[model samples]
Structure formats: structure tokens, C-alpha cells
Target chain A: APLPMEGVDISPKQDEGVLKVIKREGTGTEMPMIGDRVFVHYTGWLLDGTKFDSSLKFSFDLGKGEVIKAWDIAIATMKVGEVCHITCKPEYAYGSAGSPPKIPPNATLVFEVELFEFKGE
Target chain B: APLPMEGVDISPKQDEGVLKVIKREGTGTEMPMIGDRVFVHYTGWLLDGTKFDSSLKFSFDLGKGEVIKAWDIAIATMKVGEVCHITCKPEYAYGSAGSPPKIPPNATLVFEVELFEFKGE
Candidate 1:
């Protein structure tokens, strides 16, 4: 019999339109809410794993349209210190306009993101 | 004795940092929440009533930072079809930067706004 990959399947994952794979679980139970400013570190890449943009530290208001629809939705679901891998559909990322130069039109994107801190407004 | 200044004391008003005076009450019981697209028609002016801008129709997400702080706060509290007078302090508006060539620094702005419709997201 073939051995199962990694044996036990306990990797945390969620799929609420945006597919998310939890790389590292968070300690805090509090997740960000609307009007809260969230701080994160993230790296973005194309579906083929071509890296585009990354930031060591970044912040934007959660659910406030400061970032893309996927970020807004996914980040709001993150707790402090949680690290996640997220896959975003075109409608959630740059849609038809893409991001130009780096991101192509209608291209799905992937991200490795870590939520660090957040300030409520 | 002074004709009550034509005041019936029935005008709707609320003071929650942002003062809102309801001009035409809406029939809908449901108010806007975060991530909702709110549409409105409005005219804006300075504290001295210097009309600066007006729009026949406009739309923005209710609590998504698409508009100013005052609009986000006040509009979220409104029901569909509600017409209101809103007063925004500098902190809630353009603040020290203001909108040059029109609104000055630290200027307080007032608006006659009508919430006509909204689309949920």
C-alpha cells in the first residue's frame, strides 16, 4: 500500500470563495473587523509561481476597500500572528484591468500572507 | 408666543460626534452596513454656506473608506431614501490638507444628502 502524504491530514483550511490554507495558526482569538486597520506581511505571485510584489510590513483598513476584495475578505478572517496561503480569483484580485506590467488581465493570483497587528477604528 | 418660529419640534435629529438632521425619513427599516454600496445625491458647502460641489448621483461602499469618515459614519446610520443634513468637522473631512483651490485647511463642511439606493456586495 502507498503511504499517504504527510500521513495525518490536519492542515487547517477554509474555502469561502477565496481558498485559504493556514500555514501557521494564530494565538489570538480576535479577528479584524470592518473599520479596523490591519497590518500584514505578504508576498504575491502568479498562478505559475511568478513573483510580482511583496512587502515586509503593510497596513490597510479591513473591509474598507483599501486593498483588493480578496485581501479585504481574507484578512478580515485572520487573527493576529496567523500565516496563511490564499488563492484569489480574478474577480477578487484585479479583475479585468489586472494590475498591468506585473499582473495580467483575468489572471488568478496567489499570496502568502501573515497577519501581525491591527488597530480598531 | 413668537409663533414658535414655525417649529413643531418634530424634526428628527441625532448627535453621535457627527450630527445628522433627517429631512425626509425613509420608509425602509433596514440600514446600511459595512461592505454595502450606497448611492446618493448631494450638495456640499463650507460652514459659511459657500457651495463648492454638488452631484446629481453618487455611489460608494458604506464603510469601505470610499468616501470621507463623516460619510461612512453618517451614511451607515441612514436608511434607504432618507434625506439628511450632515455636518462634518475637519477630522471627518479633508482635514489640514483639505481640497486645495476649493476647501481651505481645517474647514468644516456641511451637506444636504439624499440616500436614494444601495447595492449590497
Candidate 2:
């Protein structure tokens, strides 16, 4: 059966109101701040469970306007010793013309992120 | 004109013994530590001056054995706030098979990397 267009069940835990965190670290205080650079390990998936990008060890600048909007808000609210699962709707993600070979059109995204560290420079 | 091979002069600074740091921040002491995850902005090129990847904003974990050998060595020696250009020989890079469409067979590589932060996950 085709999945629901709005609020697709990207994660099974979503139905239970409890997003299962596979692996996590740090706390809210450890969350990445604006202008701060951060390193992360993540796996992204689409609504139909299609895997997008999975960087076992990828790095980037935080709050430097490099990432998508949903990531910025999600990471900002996190602390150093915290690990969580984040699900972003299409409006907050790549939008209608979704990234190919990974993200389909108008798809939602789910990520398991762990706060590694922040570089002030 | 076809570029030269072997010591291809990836950076103009190599000739004059002047590796011009287009942009730099901190000292060597700010280098990332082992097991320290970091965020960085980087651009990579081949010996022929072909650009491969340029992540204006991407993130990854360090010292988790998730990256290539050269990168592991390079990042370990970099401090926070330090941004520099690194040139890697083919042997230290993707090697004979080489990474396609960007990195050719037995091609050396150059990267301009900026250390962001270390998330000790």
C-alpha cells in the first residue's frame, strides 16, 4: 500500500510517540551553537525507507548556514551529552524537488544524530 | 594545455616554498585529538586540478576510523581554528583503483580544510 502523503511513518517509533534513539551522546548543553563547527556520524532515510546519505565520519560548520533548516533547529536544541532521532517534514527538508538517488520528491527525513564537539573557529 | 604529471605543482606555493594559506584561524596546538569528532569545510582537487568534492557545510566524526588514512593523519595534526591546504600523494589516497569521476587512477590530491570543533562522543 502507498504510504500517507502527510506525516508519513518514516519511523515506526513515531506512531508510539517515542522516537527510538539507536545511539547517542552528550546533552543539550553540548548542542552545536551558531558559527560553531561540528563533526557528526549520521544516516538519513526517506519515507519509504530509502537510505540517502550516511556519513560514518563526515564534518561541517554549524550555524554557518551550510545545512538545511530542520538540521539547524534540531542541532541547536541539543546539548553535548545528548543523542536523539530527528524526523523532518518535507517543508523543513529538501522540499518538492527532492535530492535524487536518495531523497524522493516531497519526502520527509529521519536522522540519528550524536553531538560530538564544537569548534569555535 | 595538458597539465604536468608527478609533482604536478598542485599548489602554486609549492614552487616558491610558500604554501599560501588562503584562510587560516588557530595554531597547530588546536589540532583535533584522537577520538575527537569534528566539523569542517573543505574542497578537494586532483593533481590535474579537477575538483572532486566541496562541502561548504558538512559534518563527521574523527578518530573513529571512519575516514581515509591521509585524512586521519592530517586532521590529527590540525588544531582548532587552523585552516590549511594539504596535498596527498596517490599512495596515501585512494590508491591505484582511485575514486572515479573526480579522482583518477593513481592520482594525488589536494585539500583546503578548516577545522571546526571536536565533539568527544
Candidate 3:
């Protein structure tokens, strides 16, 4: 679905709560395990659709709390070549204290992600 | 002056290569001595203000050069409770190659610092 950036709802259905809307599927047969490393490109948005961050390419270990909670969990469930939109509640994000300057307090976040590869098995 | 976030030039001066611009000078009688440990909270950014690394509150001894060259010099000029903006050239910062994942190669780093306290004799 390539960046469905405009006019997408930021609020949840209460029924949809913290959801992952997969835009495109991956080719791999297996999802990455906890200790692996995933290389990806991701654009992060604040609740109001303001972009906070985007990486052309970045790599991080899976399951580590090195990133925000939403990233760890979302990437864990992803496969190489997959693109997904993952939404996070504040508690699962930077929490009551969001990433400042760009991300605000108790802000919900959205990430449009493309998982390119998983390594370091 | 607060966060001069606009229309500021990101260039170099021949003599004042790496400079410290005191935002709010500190209150204490004396600046930290060479070997004393200083406590501070700082935000590190690339020239564009996009690649930022913050929330890293840390303590380091001055003369030992325990931190980056720019930080060592900048903090040395500050007293308790002072806030300052330090601009560093590549050699005085993370160098031709930056401390990646957040900082990029040959990136000019800017540090907005708050000197909290100093320890040791």
C-alpha cells in the first residue's frame, strides 16, 4: 500500500486498539526470533500525522527494548520485504514521557515500516 | 536566548573553529577544575537538528578527556547550573566517522548542555 500517508485515521475503534495494518506481505517463511537483528526503513508519525522520524536504513536487534515498545513487537511479527503500519498507545511508546522536541507527552505513535532483512540469528 | 531554531548559519570560522556559545551562564563562583567530575544532561544533534541524541545524563572527569573533545572544552568553561550550546568541528566531535545508528559520518555535532553539579576535589 506504499505509505497511505494522507487521511488515514489515527484514532482507534476501541475495538481496534493498538493495531497493525499490514499493507504488503513478505516472502520469507519464518518470522524473526528475539535475538535476531532486523534492517529496515521506517517513518514515525505523531498522533496528528506530524512526522517525528524516518530512517532510509537502520538495523536493530529484535526483542531488545533498545527502541520503543511498538517497534520491538511490530518488527518481531514482520518478515523480510513486509510493509506494515503499527500503532502504539503511550504506555507502549515513550510512555508518559514521550520522545521530546518532536514527540509529545503521552502521544500515540504510528510507524510506516518496511522490513528489509533479518540477520544475526 | 532560547533555542535559535531558525536562520542560523552552520559554517566555520578560521580561528574560532569549535566554539561555545553560552546560553545561560552558570551561577557558581568557580568553573570546574581539570580533574573534577561534572554531571550534566545534554542533547546532541547533527547540523540540521534532525539527528539528535538526548536524555543521556552522564558524569565525566574534565582533564582526562573522558568525553568528546568539544564536550570536554565546553563543560570546562561552564559553572554549576549553566546552560550552553557547543558547536564542534569533526575532529573535536565523533570525528570523520561518527558514532553511528544516531550520528552520521563527518557530522558536525551541536550540544545543548546543562551543567548540574561537579564532584571530587
Candidate 4:
């Protein structure tokens, strides 16, 4: 039988000193600042443990107002060299109609993210 | 002057003993078998040397009529632990339109491939 969508399992192997630090680098916390660029490495997995996307060595600049809402909030509070694990429900990710092949419809995503760098323009 | 499409410089770093052996595990050499499946590890590079697609640790099952022609021919002559380098002209590859972002239009491709296993069904 397939796993249900209502509940997700999250086990943090290593909990760093800061579990959920809300602000970093004097940046405003409500929304993504215009022209803010970030260098992040992330691996996304589904509820059934299928890996969807990964940025192990490559990096991309996220344009303001071009990313999912939860990411906009989650990445705002990270500093360089800080690593965090975020489990996002479907509402915060690509909801009912998911990205094909990699991301399924109505999926929950688990991300192991490392904040590498951020520059304000 | 930019490099011409006709002349591609291939540097063979290591030449294995079964360099161009045409037959492997009792399979024909012209086209892929009707129900052939292979486990391969490959890295693709463009003329200007941009890596396109890579299968480092993951594997995929290829159906009878579902792969790029060059790959279909290249993997047919390989055995377990055999590695080869294949360079394909644009005519044999994605051709003029080309795959966006990674593979440019009218591009030639180079592949460093290792044939791991083939299981006939």
C-alpha cells in the first residue's frame, strides 16, 4: 500500500544549535527583497522517498517574485554555512497539479538545504 | 575563428584492451534489441565543453524504441566494466533546433560512457 499524504516523517540526524533562527544578516523578514540573490544547495525528496531535484555543486540565482512562497520565507532567515531541513506541505510547494516526472501532483517535499551565500543588489 | 563543426578534437586518456570490439554478450551490433535494458554511467559534453546530462550512480531501463540513436549504437558494443568515448556530429545528435539551456542548437556532443550491465527480458 502507498503512504498517505496527510502525515510525513521527519527525523533530524544532527540538530545544530539554532533550530529555527528567524532573522539573519539584518534582512527584513516579511517578504523577499527585490534584487536579492542567493546561492543555495538543496536536495528535494518526496513523501515516498523519491529524490526530485538537487543542487549539489551548481547554484542558481532566484529572482524576486519568481519562487514558491515558503522558500521566500524559509531562506530569508539563513546565514552563510547554515544548514537546515525543511519539510513543506503541498500547499507551500507545487500543490495539486505538480511538476511532472520529478514532482508529483499534491506532493509533500523534504529539503535538505545549505545556505551558501546571499548578495543584496 | 570559432571551431568548425566538421573537425572535433578527441583526446583518449586511457585506451582499454577491448577498444572497439563489436560484439558483446551475444548481441547484434546494428540496433538495440527489442527488449534490451542497460545500466550505464555517462557524462555528455558539448563542443565548447559544457556538461549536459550525466548518470553517475543512477540507472534507467531503455525500451525497444525509446532512446537517442547514438546511445542505442554506443551501448550495444560494450561489456561489463568497459568504457568508451564517443563524439557525435550535430546530424547524429540533437541537430539544428537543439535542446535549450543545456544543449545548444546545431551542436555536436561528446560522451564518456561506461557500460555496466545488460539484462534481456
Per-candidate clash tally: 1, 37, 0, 0
lDDT by residue (tens digit), candidate 3, B4-121: 5331221211234356667876776556644577889988878887847776668877645467756655665576888878778776677667876787778777888898988864
Residue lDDT tens for model 4, A22-111 = 222333222222235777778888878898888864443332324553454355445566665666667556878899878888776877
Each prediction's TM-score versus the true structure: 0.49, 0.40, 0.44, 0.36
Better structure of 2 and 3 per TM-score: 3
Candidate with better lDDT, 1 vs 2: 1
lDDT of every model, 2 decimals:
0.71, 0.57, 0.67, 0.52
Residue-by-residue lDDT tens digits, candidate 2, B25-104: 56534444434468878888875778888986556665333565445446644667777676676644676889876678
TM-score for candidate 3: 0.44
Query: Native contact fraction of candidate 4?
Result: 0.00
RMSD of 2: 18.6
Clashing pairs in 3: none
**Candidates, DockQ:** 0.10, 0.01, 0.01, 0.01
lDDT of 4 at B55: 76
Q: For candidate 2, report its TM-score.
A: 0.40
Q: What i-RMS does every model get?
A: 11.7, 16.2, 20.7, 21.7
Per-residue lDDT of candidate 2, residues A61-117 (tens digit): 653336764564455545665566777767556778888756777776777776666
**Regions of model 3 farther than 4 Å from truth:** A1-121, B2-14
Indicate the residue-level lDDT of B19 in model 3. 66
In model 2, the Cα lDDT at residue B112 comes to: 84
